[PDB]
Amino acid sequence: KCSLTGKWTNDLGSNMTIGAVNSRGEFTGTYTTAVTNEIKESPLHGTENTINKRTQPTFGFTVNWKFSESTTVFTGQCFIDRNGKEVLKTMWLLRSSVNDIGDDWKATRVGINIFTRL
Amino acid sequence: RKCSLTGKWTNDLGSNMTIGAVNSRGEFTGTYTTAVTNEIKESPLHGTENTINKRTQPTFGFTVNWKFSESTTVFTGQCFIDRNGKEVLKTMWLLRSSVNDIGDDWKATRVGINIFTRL
Amino acid sequence: KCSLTGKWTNDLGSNMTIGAVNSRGEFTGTYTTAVTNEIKESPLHGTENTINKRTQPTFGFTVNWKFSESTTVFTGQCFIDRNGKEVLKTMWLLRSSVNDIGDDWKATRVGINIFTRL
Amino acid sequence: RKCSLTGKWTNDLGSNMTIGAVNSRGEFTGTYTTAVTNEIKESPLHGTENTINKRTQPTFGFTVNWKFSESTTVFTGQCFIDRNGKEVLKTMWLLRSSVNDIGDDWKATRVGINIFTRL
């Protein structure tokens, strides 16, 4: 069973802590990233999909950055590799805030992140 | 004035969305309604609105926990006041499908956009 | 038959001209966009998929920006709407140039563009 | 020195790619080889490398014209000189599937990444 609750770290060096996942699949947590003024914490809220009670469920969460006007959403699946290790393969969209609707076209970045247990 | 997320919205695909009040922490919940040819499904959503600098056109993100499949979709965008004075949500999303092998991961994510206006 | 050859314009106001598509599905053209110093032209190269000689083929092309170090790639399908009009529904990735591999994560933007005959 | 596109590459998924010489206009052609469980397919690719400011780590883009399906994939990225001195192509791609109705357009595009190193 791949569980989201716990401590994770990714390929960029960012860390994330997720608490208990309730009966509805909802969970909260903290997302930690460094600036290079050193470390900043931002809350995250998301849900794990519980349809068919898969052992490798899909999920999604939003990171509400506390040091910028931007928002990032992550979606992915909690996998169990060949070694028996849990791994989160995710993709994200990073939304920047623009002051005019005419600039909307360049406000969204996309990328990936792989998380492993810390 | 300010663009507010709370309310009823409909998008360019015909899906409807209801968002509740946004608390002090910027959190909100709602419902997402889509069709399937009418036979309609209803799924819950949870997200947050960025409160930094209390901008009048904030960015936000939410997750839709589909109740009819094992998939998950996340949306992010900004609440704009268009040139004609109408409120409009410009969003982009990622649709994550469930795969059985970590080896099939590469083909599990679709991307697209959705524009929402008040219902 | 939805054909790529011709003049197109999109939702942002940019214009594009594509020449003849050869037997291998390859085509070239010009991509015009304004700055708001007014108009700039950049060449594009791409290919249309010819498998099963579909009347609504998929395609892809790269725009080699002549005023920046960035590159944009578009992929989409040439459709025929209910009115009988040709429409190109596309999605693109805009790659910015970063000076260090450590900044690679924030170098890619994503978006859409719908083109109609000009 | 400079990161050059010309040569043989292999990615994290196991696919191989051969890129030819890049002319003065920054144009190039090549071949993309992927497996299907070995039974391997071969498809042509055409793209360009950005020549502005003759950077040593240029951005580029190319299209792969799949010969076994009606799909098309485009890649874009940058040719980097990693910290250990190795040349590496960091890329992102969009995979466009063919749909029969403009109404199914929304679900026709997948997105992902690929990292290429010299073979």
Ligand SMILES: O=C(CCCC[C@@H]1SC[C@@H]2NC(=O)N[C@@H]21)Nc1ccc([N+](=O)[O-])cc1
């Ligand atoms: O507004 C921001 C907030 C920064 C966290 C950003 C992203 S979320 C996906 C990725 N995974 C992580 O763990 N962290 C990153 N970012 C931002 C915007 C612009 C620039 N810039 O240099 O221009 C730098 C950072």
Ligand SMILES: O=C(CCCC[C@@H]1SC[C@@H]2NC(=O)N[C@@H]21)Nc1ccc([N+](=O)[O-])cc1
């Ligand atoms: O698993 C699913 C759940 C369906 C809702 C999907 C997306 S979320 C972005 C877009 N905006 C909307 O309002 N609705 C859609 N979808 C799905 C997967 C595969 C296929 N298929 O035909 O293969 C059809 C639907």
Ligand SMILES: O=C(CCCC[C@@H]1SC[C@@H]2NC(=O)N[C@@H]21)Nc1ccc([N+](=O)[O-])cc1
């Ligand atoms: O480097 C660039 C080259 C500009 C053309 C950009 C994109 S390609 C997708 C979209 N569709 C179009 O027809 N045109 C646009 N762009 C760029 C980068 C940064 C900023 N900026 O303000 O920061 C502005 C433009």
Ligand SMILES: O=C(CCCC[C@@H]1SC[C@@H]2NC(=O)N[C@@H]21)Nc1ccc([N+](=O)[O-])cc1
């Ligand atoms: O139509 C296709 C053509 C297959 C090559 C696909 C992608 S291009 C990005 C990635 N990097 C690679 O080196 N190869 C892949 N693919 C396709 C579509 C659907 C399914 N399916 O199982 O449903 C399988 C393959």
Ligand SMILES: *[C@H]1O[C@H](CO)[C@@H](O)[C@H](O)[C@H]1NC(C)=O
């Ligand atoms: C979190 O990851 C490890 C856990 O101890 C730690 O060494 C590192 O400094 C932390 N990184 C960040 C960005 O907080």
Ligand SMILES: *[C@H]1O[C@H](CO)[C@@H](O)[C@H](O)[C@H]1NC(C)=O
């Ligand atoms: C929701 O949007 C309007 C609300 O009145 C309604 O006419 C339409 O049938 C609904 N669409 C769906 C997919 O539920």
Ligand SMILES: *[C@H]1O[C@H](CO)[C@@H](O)[C@H](O)[C@H]1NC(C)=O
């Ligand atoms: C191209 O689109 C129309 C075609 O005549 C023209 O009016 C407009 O000025 C042009 N736009 C750009 C960005 O070149």
Ligand SMILES: *[C@H]1O[C@H](CO)[C@@H](O)[C@H](O)[C@H]1NC(C)=O
């Ligand atoms: C290509 O990569 C190496 C080249 O020697 C080879 O071992 C491998 O089998 C090939 N893979 C594919 C998918 O053709």
